[PDB]
Design a binder for this molecule. Structure first.
Ligand SMILES: O=P(O)(O)O[C@H]1[C@H](OP(=O)(O)O)[C@@H](OP(=O)(O)O)[C@H](OP(=O)(O)O)[C@@H](OP(=O)(O)O)[C@H]1OP(=O)(O)O
Ligand SMILES: O=P(O)(O)O[C@H]1[C@H](OP(=O)(O)O)[C@H](OP(=O)(O)O)[C@@H](OP(=O)(O)O)[C@@H](OP(=O)(O)O)[C@H]1OP(=O)(O)O
Ligand SMILES: Nc1ncnc2c1ncn2[C@@H]1O[C@H](COP(=O)(O)OP(=O)(O)O)[C@@H](O)[C@H]1O
Ligand SMILES: Nc1ncnc2c1ncn2[C@@H]1O[C@H](COP(=O)(O)OP(=O)(O)O)[C@@H](O)[C@H]1O
Lengths: 885, 885
């Protein structure tokens, strides 16, 4: 949406005027005129949005070029910014900088010419929104949206198919056979396969089960390395060996554990099936492979009897439609006729039903809205076979999105098709792109989380993973939606442009690269960098892939020189040996995601960049000394990393009344314990997620800075993580008193701490703690005797525990909702008083005593006894990794 | 041919028995058996070759499988060799190393099985040996072949096309037009193009001429950088510059220099011409482009008036065939009819005639052979349009070719098609693969050179550049011959397999890679080495790329582990930052060519590989401190490098009477002057080409080490090179007396020497020195006055000198034949006395004073009159750089 570009430019310009007079001292007047012009123009574009846009070209034509002048203004302004910073770099003390001052005055001439263009647009019409103001549509206030829990998990109308498939199971023993699930895109084949994968009979029958995603772009070795990843924790040996050895190892592993089931998802071509088939052992067992394909021919090749997936019936369609649109609540009678007509117009395609349900929830719940929806659906679903029917339906749903949401939804298409998107990264990207601007009380990250939740509610986005707490973790757009938004962003809005090379094609030339605004590459990135391409007007660079790629020491400086006006640099997949000096002249940089293996120091020159918000660094080093003055990059909102970052010692300038208090800071992922000192904590009042990695005993020790005591200061802290790297137990560690911890702390993690279970009472005292995950022998002992305290705790996560005996009362864990038991060989059995608690529903048993599993059956049995009685306690489901237990 | 494999196995086994008994001590008996049976198999194969194996099916089978046992015996014996050396590495001092001695003895059980399998078959060979020997053919001795000096430079019946083309040019001035050239493959279009590109009228009209090859698989940036390299020295900067901006610079450079002609060679597809035409400015000047293509459609697109090439007429065919077959000599009358009939049967295709001439040369000069050839060609040329007729003709020529030479043509195909093969590299490959076996007294390299000259004489291999002295420098296979050689070597004899991948295709799997003998990769290789491949029966790896590809720091150890039985490792085009341990365990290594940029120290462990002949290192460093005890690698025959290497100080073992005197050694290309010491020269008695790089002063200084004196010891030296890197003229340098230089010295080169033109008398005193090349101010001064001495000098080459006055008499340069005056911008004129030298044939004057060029034309006119005066004077040719002179 044009408003997004105009607003971003406006915000940048006001920030530039406020923060730095010198940068804009030269052209302050034209800049301010541009700022006022942009404000009024944004008002104009809003008025235009009020009237039908997709219908009238003339309103669109008036809109057209407002952006181009804005884009030119944005460009010219950025060019000026970099030029003036380069002037500073020269450090010329001359009053009249005879060299390059004329050039910067000519840049000021470009700025003035852009001012004249915007003035010309205002001249063509004093506003141009007279006709627009004449007609106003869709007048209404803004209401709230609700965070979604897992809803309508049950699949409407596909249970019979689940039973049919589960009947194909054990059709013939001692054999490997493939079951082809054939259906049109979005018909629910993947959902049906997922259902079959979670079915209790399937889980009980086959000891080992695997989920495998065979995209259209699968990569055999990557596919095999994943399958090997599940079975064995350490994969160092298998990395170095050939794909055929990988297949042989997979075959051995599958043969080890009795019988097995594997689901190959979205097998596009028969050849891929053939190539992948070699991994699975034909070990004379009743093993089965579930295959989800959209092509009939490939399904027939896999097996002459393909299980055709059937359409939903009208009753099923209406049930699904009302469930989706109204969630738990049922449909009001007055809307039932309209909803039934809409569902009957879906012909039984679940995706159509879900998309129209999203459209309905977006529009409202009035009879007129439903009548309009029914009319539009009838209009846009005359035909049946054409896949463009779903595109038209998606268009219908999309047009009703809020403008800011539309920009995020499109910016989702940019991530590779079929690639699961980290939610946190996606949020931080939007904040960098300026899509999301501070509104109301919610902080930007919170607003972005709300945006993603709304999109999930609309059914636009799918959730692939959910954290323990239930929050979304990884999102992937559906393929049809991904294609629709890809086309939209690439053509209609030119939000981003993607270079994907066919074999015969070649990289677009410099002239074409000049037009693109944002760049996303998923083909070979290295071949692109070999071309030495140059674009002055690419501000966003994105490359997402599974395989990590090195940067040849000759191609390193390609990026900063190729693009000098970068904001978003997402090169996480690209491994960098070092950084050229040209990187330290990307002043318009907001986001930096890069991976390195040798980088040990973050250099000082990184400090000079000022607009950066996020920083993500993957390095194999066990230490990452940060020498850049983070205390000066005021906009800094995150410093992510996985090493033991050692923050620089804060030092207030001897002759400054500026306090280096970065009020914007939110995260410090894995800073080193030595840095957990009073000053750094004092400098980050609003910190909201801390984590440490290194010698935790330094925190706990008195001699060092009493770091765990200093942690009391972060009044707002809500996520703590202690990681102990020392593989040597030099002594025992005793936590501090419960009052030292930040009051709001809601999520805590302990890894390799080896704490004494007598301290668990300390964590019990915490009032708000809601997610306690201790892993890698976080707490070491043999007898745990819970002493209550965890009033608010909702989930408990134990892994690699050497605990022999645990004793609990129903009062000890009142709110607990889910329990995870991993590598708990020592523990004999799980206290029954935990079975008493109603909240506790789901628990996972892995690598634990079979007696513990029988007592877990007893726990589920008490919950099932409540079920049989009808007494109301939250329903209970059991997961045990080894079925034998 | 099978004899080649058997002979190589026999030689390697004999060498293993002689040198190292411990490696063979385990299976000495099976080794000696194998040796005997292999000798008998070699004799049997020779006898079968005497007969026509193809004629009889029984024979085909009898020859078949003798090779398989030999290949099987090689694999087992090599595996034992490496395993036993690994045992030595273990250093298990136990009398019975029962653990893992039974593994190496498992390999030994394979060995013994093989020995028994050979004794079988030897028995099967015993039967029928008499039946084979009952028949024989082609009973004749071997005669001498002679060196291939340039001949038949003129092109038969093609001056009509040349004049037509030169007429087509200059049609429309102030405009840029491209003239198509069309015709079937091998029709001579490139020959005509090169003829035109050298015609004096062309060399007079257009100042700027450029010749460019456009393969089937060209790469635009590569050729643009090369085109720029013509006008300016360096290309490394533009390596950081985009293809389109490269094109802009090319256009500027080319437009600055008056008019221009450019020849694009072998254009295949329209898209390529479209993409490439950009660099040429249509700057409103009379400029032309000459493109050669085999397709009519591309030619028509480039211009509606393509120039069809004409077939050679029967008289033209006969004259060409006679010139090729009989060289300068005329045809004997008795063979005239057969020759005319054969030429008539070639239908005027120059390539067919050329290959037929090669075949006739191979057969001999008897009427029976000519009648047989006439019959055969009549047989194989009933059709005209079928391209396979030329394939049949080359097969006919090939059949008569000695198997040593036959092993080439097929190994020649390994180099990427269209690649310019460095002759020296090709010969050292030959030697390393073992295709050239000791037969007589000529040094191996000499035998290779004669093989290559014979290949050229039969016309199978076309030469591209000759060194100054005329010895070949760079050759290639013709396209038709290349496809014929590639198909044949891959299918019939399985000499090697190319891995190059097509679209929607995959790298062959480990099963396929188990049946390969040699790997040639000419396309993406980093992709191949990211597959983590594996093969045990691959002995050779060839990668003749275009760009220098780095090796990712994580993907380095793929080659040593992918192939542990390597001999030839030609990875010159792959930049390695370091070497893995698994590389040092490679023991079957003869040839090792590789590049680098940061490698400063050759590792010590690299000196353990006992079996290496060649070594090539294109390290960018200025210094390459060698620490491998080259003195210990008894088969070392070359140590090529480009930086200034520092050979380890020799130390005769304290307790061994074994002298570390290498007598195979031939070259120490670029050792450091510090390492031109007495001992380093005692240890290389048969050294035959030495070069130095560094501060030449330390040599010419007698206080440090009388090093240019020590050069006196190398009684056989025949190529010296003194390269000075010190850019600071600290002092003047004085050559030692002429009696110090080795007597046979036939080539000398001096760069940055800054010697006083007075010393030139010393170089005059040398009696055999035949080619003197002084580049980048070899001698410093302004007045040179010849005093004689250069009795045998044949080529004089001066580049980048400040010589002003040159004075000489005709008696100072009696034998001179070639004179090159490059970048002599201060010289005034050249002594006209040179006009009197009979041998003086060719002189080239580049970028020099116009007065010198006037004197050059005076010399040219004088020699014209001399030849006109009835004297049997050889033809003279004058090359002057700028057309105005
Ligand atoms: O053909 P090359 O193998 O490349 O070597 C010859 C020359 O030695 P010779 O004249 O005795 O053959 C130099 O020796 P090397 O460097 O190969 O050891 C070489 O020097 P540079 O490659 O460093 O330049 C030179 O190179 P170039 O062809 O570029 O002049 C080249 O000269 P010629 O081929 O004319 O003899
Ligand atoms: O398994 P991981 O991918 O490594 O993620 C877990 C954790 O997952 P859960 O929230 O589901 O327990 C969080 O991952 P995200 O959802 O943020 O992607 C995050 O920890 P927080 O919840 O505290 O943010 C992360 O971070 P870290 O590696 O710093 O602990 C932590 O990793 P671990 O599994 O290694 O603990
Ligand atoms: N019976 C069903 N109930 C709910 N959603 C369904 C059903 N069948 C298909 N779907 C669709 O599947 C989505 C989630 O599964 P998904 O992986 O997208 O499968 P598919 O795209 O094959 O339908 C739902 O949001 C909905 O759009
Ligand atoms: N009169 C001639 N005209 C053309 N080619 C000739 C002639 N005499 C000999 N030849 C040889 O025949 C071949 C002509 O085809 P060639 O130039 O190899 O193929 P292409 O033109 O496709 O590159 C060359 O080897 C050339 O030297």
């Amino acid at each position: 949406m044009a408003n997004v570009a105009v607003e971003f430019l406006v915000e940048n310009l006001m920030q530039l005027l406020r923060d730095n007079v010198e940068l804009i001292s030269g052209v302050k007047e034209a800049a301010e005129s541009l700022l006022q012009d942009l404000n009024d123009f944004n008002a104009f574009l809003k008025q235009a949005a009020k009237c039908h846009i997709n219908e009238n070209e003339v309103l669109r034509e008036l809109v057209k070029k407002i952006r181009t002048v804005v884009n030119s203004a944005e460009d010219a302004i950025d060019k000026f910014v970099i030029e003036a910073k380069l002037h500073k770099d020269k450090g010329v003390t001359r009053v009249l900088d005879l060299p390059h001052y004329k050039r910067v005055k000519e840049v000021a001439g470009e700025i003035k010419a852009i001012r004249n263009k915007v003035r010309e647009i205002r001249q063509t019409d004093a506003i141009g929104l007279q006709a627009l103001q004449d007609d106003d549509l869709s007048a209404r206030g803004s209401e709230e949206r609700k965070p979604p829990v897992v809803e309508e998990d049950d699949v409407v109308g596909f249970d019979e198919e689940a039973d049919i498939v589960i009947n194909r199971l054990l059709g013939e023993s001692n054999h490997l056979e493939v079951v082809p699930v054939v259906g049109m895109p979005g018909l629910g084949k993947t959902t049906l396969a997922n259902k079959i994968y979670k079915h209790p009979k399937i889980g009980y029958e086959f000891f080992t089960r695997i989920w495998v995603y065979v995209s259209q772009s699968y990569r055999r070795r990557e596919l095999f390395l994943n399958i090997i990843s599940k079975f064995t924790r350490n994969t160092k040996q298998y990395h170095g060996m050939c794909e055929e050895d990988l297949a042989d190892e997979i075959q051995e592993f599958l043969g080890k554990g009795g019988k097995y089931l594997v689901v190959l998802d979205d097998v596009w071509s028969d050849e891929a099936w053939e190539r992948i088939k070699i991994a699975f052992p034909n070990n004379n067992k009743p093993n089965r492979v579930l295959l989800t394909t959209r092509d009939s021919k490939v399904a027939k090749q896999c097996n002459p009897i393909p299980h055709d997936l059937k359409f939903l019936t009208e009753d099923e369609s209406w049930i699904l439609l009302e469930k989706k649109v109204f969630h738990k609540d049922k449909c009001p009678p007055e809307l039932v006729l309209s909803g039934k007509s809409i569902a009957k117009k879906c012909k039984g395609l679940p995706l159509a039903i879900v998309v129209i349900a999203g459209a309905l929830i977006g529009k409202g719940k009035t009879p007129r809205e439903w009548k309009q929806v029914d009319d539009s659906v009838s209009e846009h679903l005359i035909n049946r076979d054409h896949p463009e029917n779903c595109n038209k339906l998606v268009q219908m749903s999309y047009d009703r999105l809020p403008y800011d949401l539309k920009a995020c939804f499109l910016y989702c298409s940019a991530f590779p098709g079929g690639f699961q998107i980290p939610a946190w990264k996606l949020i931080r990207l939007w904040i960098a792109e300026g899509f999301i601007q501070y509104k109301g009380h919610l902080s930007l990250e919170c607003k972005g989380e709300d945006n993603l939740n709304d999109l999930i509610n609309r059914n636009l986005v799918m959730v692939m993973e959910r954290t323990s707490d239930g929050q979304i973790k990884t999102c992937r757009l559906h393929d049809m939606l991904h294609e629709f938004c890809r086309q939209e962003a690439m053509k209609e809005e030119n939000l981003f442009q993607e270079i994907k090379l066919g074999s015969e094609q070649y990289f677009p030339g410099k002239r074409e690269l000049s037009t693109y605004r944002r760049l996303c590459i998923h083909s070979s990135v290295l071949d692109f960098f070999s071309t030495k391409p140059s674009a002055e007007h690419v501000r966003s660079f994105l490359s997402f892939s599974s395989k990590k790629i090195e940067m040849p020491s000759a191609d390193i400086p390609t990026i900063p020189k190729g693009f000098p006006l970068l904001r978003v640099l997402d090169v996480e997949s690209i491994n960098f040996s070092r950084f050229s000096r040209e990187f330290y002249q990307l002043y318009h940089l907001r986001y930096v995601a890069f991976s390195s293996d040798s980088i040990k120091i973050l250099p000082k020159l990184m400090g000079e960049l000022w607009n950066i918000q996020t920083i993500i660094i993957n390095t194999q080093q066990r230490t990452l000394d940060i020498q850049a003055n983070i205390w000066n990059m005021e906009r800094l909102r995150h410093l992510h990393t996985n090493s033991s970052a050692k923050l620089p010692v804060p030092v207030a300038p001897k002759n400054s009344k500026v306090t280096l208090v970065n009020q914007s800071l939110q995260t410090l992922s894995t800073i080193a314990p030595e840095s957990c000192t009073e000053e750094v904590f004092a400098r980050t009042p609003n910190l909201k997620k801390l984590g440490i990695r290194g010698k935790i005993s330094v925190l706990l020790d008195n001699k060092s800075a009493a770091s765990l005591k200093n942690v009391k200061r972060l009044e707002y802290l809500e996520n703590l993580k202690l990681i102990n790297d020392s593989s040597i137990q030099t002594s025992k560690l005793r936590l501090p008193p419960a009052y030292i911890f930040p009051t709001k702390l809601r999520k805590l993690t302990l890894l390799d701490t080896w704490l004494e279970w007598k301290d668990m009472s300390i964590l019990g005292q915490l009032e708000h703690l809601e997610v306690l995950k201790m892993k890698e022998n976080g707490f070491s002992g043999e007898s745990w005797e819970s002493t209550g305290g965890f009033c608010s705790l909702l989930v408990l996560w134990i892994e690699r525990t050497n605990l022999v005996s645990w004793k609990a009362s129903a009062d000890d864990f009142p709110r607990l909702k889910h329990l995870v038991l991993i590598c708990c060989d020592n523990l004999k059995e799980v206290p029954i008083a935990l079975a008493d608690i109603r909240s506790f529903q789901v628990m996972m048993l892995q690598n634990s005593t079979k007696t513990a599993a029988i007592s877990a059956r007893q726990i589920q049995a008490k919950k099932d006894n409540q079920t049989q009685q009808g007494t109301k306690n939250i329903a209970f489901k059991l997961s045990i990794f080894p079925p034998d237990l």
